[PDB]
């Protein structure tokens, strides 16, 4: 934020989508991902939970519960969401002023030179 569009931060994509929905609305996620990883529910090796947990994650994925919860916490509880033309400032047309004075500067030279050297 404090580098005026000169620092790009490489980070995980789920935080990158989360910080984009915070206040300020200053940051943006660009491109696609660079690698591919996953977050899993972990149990100790050899456990009664393991196989019903694995079949639960697949059932929540295909029913759309895991997509519903991500829209909820990343976007529906997202601060950022988703005019009135302003007057032209002088910084936009400052070039024709410099060409104006630079055109008057090169015109007084041709006056002072050539009439003396007639």
């Amino acid at each position: 934020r404090k580098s005026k569009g000169k620092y790009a931060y490489l980070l995980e994509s789920t935080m990158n989508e989360y910080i984009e929905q915070r206040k300020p609305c200053d940051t943006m996620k660009v491109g696609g991902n660079l690698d591919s990883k996953g977050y899993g529910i972990a149990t100790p090796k050899g456990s009664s939970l393991g196989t019903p947990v694995n079949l639960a994650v697949l059932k929540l994925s295909e029913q759309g519960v895991l997509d519903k919860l991500k829209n909820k916490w990343w976007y529906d509880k997202g601060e950022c969401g988703a005019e009135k033309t302003s007057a032209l400032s002088l910084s936009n047309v400052a070039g024709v002023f410099y060409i104006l004075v630079g055109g008057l500067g090169l015109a007084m030279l041709v006056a002072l030179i050539e009439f003396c050297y007639k």
């Binding site: 002088l90 910084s91 004075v101």
Partner: protein, 134 residues
């Protein structure tokens, strides 16, 4: 020099450690200097030329320096104003902030000094062509 924002009377007169508006008006600085330099040299040539009108040649090249002072005073003001608006663009755009620039009487006296030293230059081309006449 600051005011009510933390109320400190800290005239920093910046040369070292610290906003960037105050660094961009540093970039525009040489043009009111060269304008003030060409005003002064246009008058210390003018003051002696009231004592010596004897050839004609004086008030022309001082009147060049009155007009070349105001033209670099234009570029002074254009660089000054555009440097404000470049940095008023890059602040942040929230619906809960407000930035308000305002030009003061020190800005205005520089702009009034344009019209005087340009009109002084116009009469300085007048009485040069009256002494070239006489």
């Amino acid at each position: 020099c600051f005011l009510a924002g933390e109320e400190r009377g800290r005239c920093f007169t910046i040369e070292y450690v610290m906003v960037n508006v105050l660094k961009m008006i540093r970039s525009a600085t040489p043009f009111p200097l060269v304008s003030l330099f060409f005003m002064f040299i246009g008058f210390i040539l003018s003051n002696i030329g009231h004592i010596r009108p004897h050839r004609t040649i004086l008030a022309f090249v001082s009147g060049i320096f009155f007009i070349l002072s105001g033209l670099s005073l234009v570029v002074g003001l254009v660089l000054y104003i555009s440097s404000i608006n470049d940095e008023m663009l890059n602040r942040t755009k929230d619906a809960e902030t407000y930035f308000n620039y305002k030009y003061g009487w020190s800005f205005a006296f520089a702009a009034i000094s344009f019209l005087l030293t340009e009109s002084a230059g116009v009469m300085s081309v007048y009485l040069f062509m009256k002494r070239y006449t006489a």
